[PDB]
Amino acid sequence: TSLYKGVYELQTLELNMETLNMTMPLSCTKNNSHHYIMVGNETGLELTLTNTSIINHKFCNLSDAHKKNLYDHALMSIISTFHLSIPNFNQYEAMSCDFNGGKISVQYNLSHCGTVANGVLQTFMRMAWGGSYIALDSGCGDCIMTSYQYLIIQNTTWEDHCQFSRPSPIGYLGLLSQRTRDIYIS
Amino acid sequence: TSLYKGVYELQTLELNMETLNMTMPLSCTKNNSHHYIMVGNETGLELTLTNTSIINHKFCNLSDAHKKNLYDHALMSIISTFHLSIPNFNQYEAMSCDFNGGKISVQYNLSCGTVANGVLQTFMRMAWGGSYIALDSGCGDCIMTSYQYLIIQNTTWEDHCQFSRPSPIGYLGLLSQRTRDIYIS
Amino acid sequence: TSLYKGVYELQTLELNMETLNMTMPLSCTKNNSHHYIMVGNETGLELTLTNTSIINHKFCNLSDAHKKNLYDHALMSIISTFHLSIPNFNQYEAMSCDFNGGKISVQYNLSCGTVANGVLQTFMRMAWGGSYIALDSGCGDCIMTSYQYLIIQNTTWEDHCQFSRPSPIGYLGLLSQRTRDIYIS
Amino acid sequence: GTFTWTLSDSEGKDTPGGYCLTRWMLIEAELKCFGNTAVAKCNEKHDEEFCDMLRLFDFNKQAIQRLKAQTSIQLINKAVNALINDQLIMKNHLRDIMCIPYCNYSKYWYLNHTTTGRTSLPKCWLVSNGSYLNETHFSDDIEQQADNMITEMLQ
Amino acid sequence: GTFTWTLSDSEGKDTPGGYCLTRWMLIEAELKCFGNTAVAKCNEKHDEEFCDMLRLFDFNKQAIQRLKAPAQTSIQLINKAVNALINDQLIMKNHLRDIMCIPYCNYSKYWYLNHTTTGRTSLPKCWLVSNGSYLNETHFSDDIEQQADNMITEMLQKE
Amino acid sequence: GTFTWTLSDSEGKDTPGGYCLTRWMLIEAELKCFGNTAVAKCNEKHDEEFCDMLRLFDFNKQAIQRLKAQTSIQLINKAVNALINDQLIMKNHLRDIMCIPYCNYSKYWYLNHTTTGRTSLPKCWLVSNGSYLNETHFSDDIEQQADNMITEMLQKE
Ligand SMILES: *[C@@H]1O[C@H](CO)[C@@H](O[C@@H]2O[C@H](CO)[C@@H](O[C@@H]3O[C@H](CO)[C@@H](O)[C@H](O[C@H]4O[C@H](CO)[C@@H](O)[C@H](O)[C@@H]4O)[C@@H]3O)[C@H](O)[C@H]2NC(C)=O)[C@H](O)[C@H]1NC(C)=O
Ligand SMILES: *[C@@H]1O[C@H](CO)[C@@H](O[C@@H]2O[C@H](CO)[C@@H](O[C@@H]3O[C@H](CO)[C@@H](O)[C@H](O[C@H]4O[C@H](CO)[C@@H](O)[C@H](O)[C@@H]4O)[C@@H]3O)[C@H](O)[C@H]2NC(C)=O)[C@H](O)[C@H]1NC(C)=O
Ligand SMILES: *[C@@H]1O[C@H](CO)[C@@H](O[C@@H]2O[C@H](CO)[C@@H](O[C@@H]3O[C@H](CO)[C@@H](O)[C@H](O[C@H]4O[C@H](CO)[C@@H](O)[C@H](O)[C@@H]4O)[C@@H]3O)[C@H](O)[C@H]2NC(C)=O)[C@H](O)[C@H]1NC(C)=O
Ligand SMILES: *[C@@H]1O[C@H](CO)[C@@H](O[C@@H]2O[C@H](CO)[C@@H](O[C@@H]3O[C@H](CO)[C@@H](O)[C@H](O)[C@@H]3O)[C@H](O)[C@H]2NC(C)=O)[C@H](O)[C@H]1NC(C)=O
Ligand SMILES: *[C@@H]1O[C@H](CO)[C@@H](O[C@@H]2O[C@H](CO)[C@@H](O[C@@H]3O[C@H](CO)[C@@H](O)[C@H](O)[C@@H]3O)[C@H](O)[C@H]2NC(C)=O)[C@H](O)[C@H]1NC(C)=O
Ligand SMILES: *[C@@H]1O[C@H](CO)[C@@H](O[C@@H]2O[C@H](CO)[C@@H](O[C@@H]3O[C@H](CO)[C@@H](O)[C@H](O)[C@@H]3O)[C@H](O)[C@H]2NC(C)=O)[C@H](O)[C@H]1NC(C)=O
Ligand SMILES: *[C@@H]1O[C@H](CO)[C@@H](O[C@@H]2O[C@H](CO)[C@@H](O)[C@H](O)[C@H]2NC(C)=O)[C@H](O)[C@H]1NC(C)=O
Ligand SMILES: *[C@@H]1O[C@H](CO)[C@@H](O[C@@H]2O[C@H](CO)[C@@H](O)[C@H](O)[C@H]2NC(C)=O)[C@H](O)[C@H]1NC(C)=O
Ligand SMILES: *[C@@H]1O[C@H](CO)[C@@H](O[C@@H]2O[C@H](CO)[C@@H](O)[C@H](O)[C@H]2NC(C)=O)[C@H](O)[C@H]1NC(C)=O
Ligand SMILES: *[C@@H]1O[C@H](CO)[C@@H](O[C@@H]2O[C@H](CO)[C@@H](O)[C@H](O)[C@H]2NC(C)=O)[C@H](O)[C@H]1NC(C)=O
């Protein structure tokens, strides 16, 4: 098809990351609003950007949730890596959660350059590595802005969601190093 | 003895890690129940697996212990490294401690995914030599042991390393995977 | 002007780190007492060793300061990297702060193994160039200084780097050893 | 540190070293095998993205064959730095931030000799704004790989 | 991991690979250029301090050119990229040497060999310093001697 | 990053860089010396376990000779990564978990010439369920080392 030096033919291959589902999580995006992280063939996590909120109380009962060991430990591990990877997070009010009955659900209020919405969107940009630019509108520029007001993270069941981008573990594996690399004093 | 290509003789070499005692800790094991981590030539640390408990109160007065700066800072460093290295530690009720007078003593009440697994995985790493003899788990993440408590106490140095030689490889590996798996508080 | 092997002449070069001011912080020192960290061409930090204190209350209202998002986010990220890089920090009474109106100012009350050693070890690393002048230490886990307080304050940029050239190597080194040595809370 | 995981050899191979990707590891493609001379570069270099993927695929293969658990996330969290170069994907993250064509780890390209059947180590097919680059935009990269193929074929 | 940042080539250079430091990157000096044969070692070795500085200077150059300048100097970018540019354990090595009274590298001055007629230069090694004063040539003479021999071996490897 | 510590050498030695382990560093053995050509691989390779031990033993020696203090754990907590490959010991932990013969960093094997005395770099003697492997179970590893020894002795001439 395309020959170089008359003897070397240019050939390609595309990896199907879906087969890594049993060992590592996989990030992907459905459309502009919805993005997903898949753990195995059953459980998962849905990162959705919406102008509509889902939690109105500004409390996060993590200690209660830990004691009542109902939630999936895997999903809790990736929801911790996300919140820790946020840089310069200083407005705990925007962080509101609801872990009643193991159902994990976390909401980040982006309405509250340098603001708390940048750091949460920077970490979201890394997390869903494929197809995150579609929701960002940012381009190249540090400072990230979006029309949407809330980033809602909910537990969900596995389906054929990865429509815009293929699944990949590259996003999650990168946040692991930059986990507690940027946090203020408590 | 046995020569390869007629000119190269196969020879051996066994290192004595005990000489590294002044710079880095050294883990080893005595029998199935008793394991040790040595720092220097006097102060040490014993971590044991017993069906008999040593602490019945379920509190860990860590802030009080820090303020009364009596304990050995080295032994506190390796016990912070241990507790931090536990992945998915979510039931604080099992950890009970007693640091009265500097004497450090920590008890983990054991009982796939339970808190006993994360503590035994970190114990498997800590005493790298001869941890398998107590795990009874083989190869298979999920570790199950018959013992009910893992008790960590300070101790004095003796010729304890009877089943496995002392080595620092155990402690050195937990230093990187220190705070790598910890939930939000 | 010194030839090796008759053809190879020995030549040198000295890097001007001041041009990296827009990308990374830069540590340097003015005299024995005063040291600085420079972030850009306008803001910065002042590390001072003085027998004279600046804060008398023993509280550090960090949560209030976070909520009132006035301070420079870059400056506090250096304050966090510094405080986290302190090994075996067990007496919170020495750290006293004042972040009223975004003006960040942190004071470490100094007085082997004490809290002063860990704060001076981190200070020795932070201002990599010309930290030995204030230490009086020489070579030896034990640093002792005559000064009683380490005060970090926000300041404006001036031609401060007189004794040592500015460099980012100090800051870049603490980033890896950030939370590597911290006790259980 | 750096990656220490060595790729495991299958039993029906002619030379110890090569690695093969099954038809279920590749999307819309049959199985492809790569020779020892190419995969040997995975142990030397630190910068190759396709090597990082082979170590991930191999680790997933070895972990399924030898263990039983899907909370297996604890295992990869320990092993990540022994399989991949963390800074290599940070490099791609930096390139994406700077409007530079980056590697999203999906498509790769390689040169395949017409009669020898020998292949280069697959390099990553870069992408910029949701579309892979044309052959015309990295043709001098392919030219350089073809030159390395000839000098290797002579040895 | 280890550093993956590759040094960017300017448009007018004759051979692809060399790197140049402007007169504003060097103090009390004009611009200095280093050949591809020297800079190539920066991709192989993990222990060279002058290489870690080149990646810092290049990253700073690339970030200013390609990224719209921040309002008030955001530090988040370098905190992400540090391990992809420098060897952290290399500067920890110099921190160990300073602690042990050994001459260490404070990343300011470097020395290299320049052939008087061909113009090729070795990779600049770090000029060590002990107690606020750089070492005399007399105290690392045998380090320079070894570099000349490697220069000879590298020059003969071309012919 | 990766280890940057270079193995210092003692004052009274024939060749610079050649390392020796004293009789107190070995168990039930006298002192053994390894030539420069062997230990030079410690700076190139990231994979060798015996090299990470030499950097530990040398660092121990250097810290004792040059400093005074036991709480010196703070020093090894800083310099661990400049000495040993963290992911190399994680490798053997993965092998142990997967029932693969792993390296417990105690015993090492190497080839030694009958007349030359030049030796290979000691590779780790693997162990599976509390017992070291027989020579018969890694025989093809020693064969490959002997071929590398021949190709290295030829480059001398
Ligand atoms: C790396 O970048 C490339 C390019 O930006 C990116 O490639 C894109 O991947 C998606 C996902 O596979 C492709 O979308 C497909 O498009 C075809 C035809 O357009 C559809 O038929 C596909 O739909 C099937 O799959 C859906 C989800 O499984 C099902 O719901 C549906 O019913 C169909 O069965 C699918 O939508 C897209 O075409 C490419 N783009 C290009 C230019 O090739 C890749 O995803 C990136 N990699 C990573 C890891 O992010
Ligand atoms: C690495 O170690 C070396 C050696 O210890 C160290 O070099 C020293 O750097 C300082 C700072 O640049 C030098 O001090 C200069 O001295 C000259 C005269 O010798 C003065 O003219 C300079 O003063 C000018 O600078 C002021 C502040 O910028 C200006 O306001 C004004 O224009 C002054 O004229 C300056 O003080 C010192 O001489 C060297 N020492 C040696 C031995 O060369 C270097 O800083 C270290 N690197 C790092 C990164 O720490
Ligand atoms: C790596 O794996 C190997 C093999 O599994 C392992 O080697 C074992 O080390 C132990 C401890 O050194 C050996 O046990 C010895 O056995 C002899 C008799 O066989 C005894 O005489 C020894 O007792 C002396 O030492 C005791 C403790 O100091 C004293 O209390 C006592 O009075 C004696 O003086 C000792 O128990 C064991 O034989 C070997 N196994 C083999 C197969 O060689 C090694 O420990 C592992 N390395 C690490 C770092 O874990
Ligand atoms: C998650 O990953 C697993 C494993 O990586 C995927 O399962 C794998 O699916 C393939 C294709 O269905 C299986 O191949 C099959 O092999 C048998 C013979 O063994 C053959 O008869 C079939 O025709 C097919 O080729 C493979 O065995 C299987 N592996 C395992 C361990 O189950 C799974 O599909 C992935 N799931 C998701 C939701 O991504
Ligand atoms: C902890 O480690 C230290 C140092 O690694 C061990 O001390 C060392 O012990 C050896 C053997 O006793 C000493 O060697 C001796 O050297 C003198 C000459 O100075 C010689 O006359 C003797 O015959 C012997 O060869 C070595 O000097 C000594 N080093 C130090 C710094 O004390 C110690 O034994 C270890 N302790 C434990 C409990 O493992
Ligand atoms: C560690 O945790 C275990 C389990 O969480 C604790 O065991 C529990 O201890 C209580 C109090 O001793 C037991 O209650 C008693 O049960 C008997 C019947 O077995 C009953 O007749 C008594 O009236 C009393 O209620 C409980 O059974 C026991 N549960 C199990 C599963 O063993 C243990 O006490 C904890 N240890 C420490 C030191 O905290
Ligand atoms: C992206 O896809 C999701 C799922 O297909 C869409 O979410 C649905 O939106 C409708 C209308 O608001 C709701 O009635 C459904 O309940 C939603 N489904 C889920 C699973 O939440 C979403 O509208 C799509 N967005 C875009 C921009 O295409
Ligand atoms: C988190 O815990 C707090 C305290 O247990 C809960 O707040 C209480 O909620 C009940 C029911 O609405 C009220 O009657 C109490 O007055 C509340 N107490 C306080 C101090 O606010 C809260 O509902 C919990 N939140 C979640 C999501 O579980
Ligand atoms: C979510 O709400 C925001 C804010 O109301 C919307 O952004 C506004 O869009 C209008 C129309 O383009 C502009 O006139 C406003 O200036 C925007 N406000 C801001 C703060 O940017 C956004 O379009 C909404 N998104 C969706 C999907 O409905
Ligand atoms: C392992 O060794 C320890 C110490 O030698 C044994 O613990 C002793 O057990 C006896 C009998 O109960 C007690 O009287 C001693 O006080 C114990 N010593 C210590 C230091 O605790 C232990 O029994 C041994 N276990 C096995 C399985 O061999």
Ligand SMILES: *[C@@H]1O[C@H](CO)[C@@H](O[C@@H]2O[C@H](CO)[C@@H](O)[C@H](O)[C@H]2NC(C)=O)[C@H](O)[C@H]1NC(C)=O
């Ligand atoms: C410690 O206690 C546990 C639990 O009582 C013992 O494990 C039991 O052993 C018996 C006899 O083999 C079994 O019938 C039980 O099913 C076991 N229970 C469990 C929960 O595993 C264990 O043997 C005791 N260990 C020691 C050293 O006394």
Ligand SMILES: *[C@@H]1O[C@H](CO)[C@@H](O[C@@H]2O[C@H](CO)[C@@H](O)[C@H](O)[C@H]2NC(C)=O)[C@H](O)[C@H]1NC(C)=O
């Ligand atoms: C901060 O760094 C910038 C850029 O590295 C320096 O600005 C450069 O100054 C030189 C000499 O005047 C000019 O030729 C360049 O064009 C400038 N570059 C830019 C991007 O402006 C600046 O001098 C440094 N500031 C301080 C205080 O060190």
Ligand SMILES: *[C@@H]1O[C@H](CO)[C@@H](O[C@@H]2O[C@H](CO)[C@@H](O)[C@H](O)[C@H]2NC(C)=O)[C@H](O)[C@H]1NC(C)=O
């Ligand atoms: C180091 O330099 C600083 C700044 O030049 C000196 O601090 C000044 O000291 C005088 C006398 O006490 C005060 O009037 C000034 O207000 C101080 N300036 C600042 C910015 O604090 C300091 O005395 C010098 N120390 C040494 C040892 O030379």
Ligand SMILES: *[C@@H]1O[C@H](CO)[C@@H](O[C@@H]2O[C@H](CO)[C@@H](O)[C@H](O)[C@H]2NC(C)=O)[C@H](O)[C@H]1NC(C)=O
């Ligand atoms: C700061 O105060 C300390 C303590 O008051 C001073 O150190 C004392 O210096 C005197 C005179 O050399 C000695 O006699 C004391 O023994 C020292 N005390 C201690 C605890 O070291 C120090 O010199 C003062 N520094 C300045 C700059 O005023």
Ligand SMILES: *[C@@H]1O[C@H](CO)[C@@H](O[C@@H]2O[C@H](CO)[C@@H](O)[C@H](O)[C@H]2NC(C)=O)[C@H](O)[C@H]1NC(C)=O
């Ligand atoms: C290189 O190209 C050759 C030929 O184009 C490939 O060999 C073919 O492999 C397919 C499937 O494995 C077979 O159906 C064909 O019969 C083979 N053709 C020949 C001529 O042998 C080879 O797989 C390619 N190599 C790679 C790595 O893709």
Ligand SMILES: *[C@@H]1O[C@H](CO)[C@@H](O[C@@H]2O[C@H](CO)[C@@H](O)[C@H](O)[C@H]2NC(C)=O)[C@H](O)[C@H]1NC(C)=O
């Ligand atoms: C390789 O073999 C030689 C000879 O078998 C060893 O050299 C001997 O070492 C012992 C103890 O150090 C001396 O007493 C002998 O005099 C030496 N013999 C000769 C001929 O030199 C050498 O030690 C071996 N190499 C290693 C690393 O053990």
Ligand SMILES: *[C@@H]1O[C@H](CO)[C@@H](O)[C@H](O)[C@H]1NC(C)=O
């Ligand atoms: C989010 O914050 C905005 C502004 O602070 C506020 O108006 C809104 O009510 C908040 N929403 C929630 C759900 O807290």
Ligand SMILES: *[C@@H]1O[C@H](CO)[C@@H](O)[C@H](O)[C@H]1NC(C)=O
């Ligand atoms: C989340 O998990 C809970 C408990 O397992 C379940 O009841 C709920 O339906 C899940 N949410 C979704 C969207 O599947």
Ligand SMILES: *[C@@H]1O[C@H](CO)[C@@H](O)[C@H](O)[C@H]1NC(C)=O
């Ligand atoms: C533990 O330390 C305390 C205080 O140093 C000491 O009194 C006690 O004896 C130690 N415990 C043992 C078992 O040696």
Ligand SMILES: *[C@@H]1O[C@H](CO)[C@@H](O)[C@H](O)[C@H]1NC(C)=O
């Ligand atoms: C610092 O500590 C010393 C001794 O504990 C005390 O005398 C002094 O008042 C303290 N200073 C401040 C500002 O707290």
Ligand SMILES: *[C@@H]1O[C@H](CO)[C@@H](O)[C@H](O)[C@H]1NC(C)=O
């Ligand atoms: C510190 O910052 C505050 C607020 O920006 C400012 O008012 C004050 O002058 C600064 N301090 C110095 C010494 O510049």
Ligand SMILES: *[C@@H]1O[C@H](CO)[C@@H](O)[C@H](O)[C@H]1NC(C)=O
């Ligand atoms: C080497 O010397 C020549 C002639 O003196 C000079 O032009 C060149 O710039 C020098 N090289 C460097 C790197 O300074």
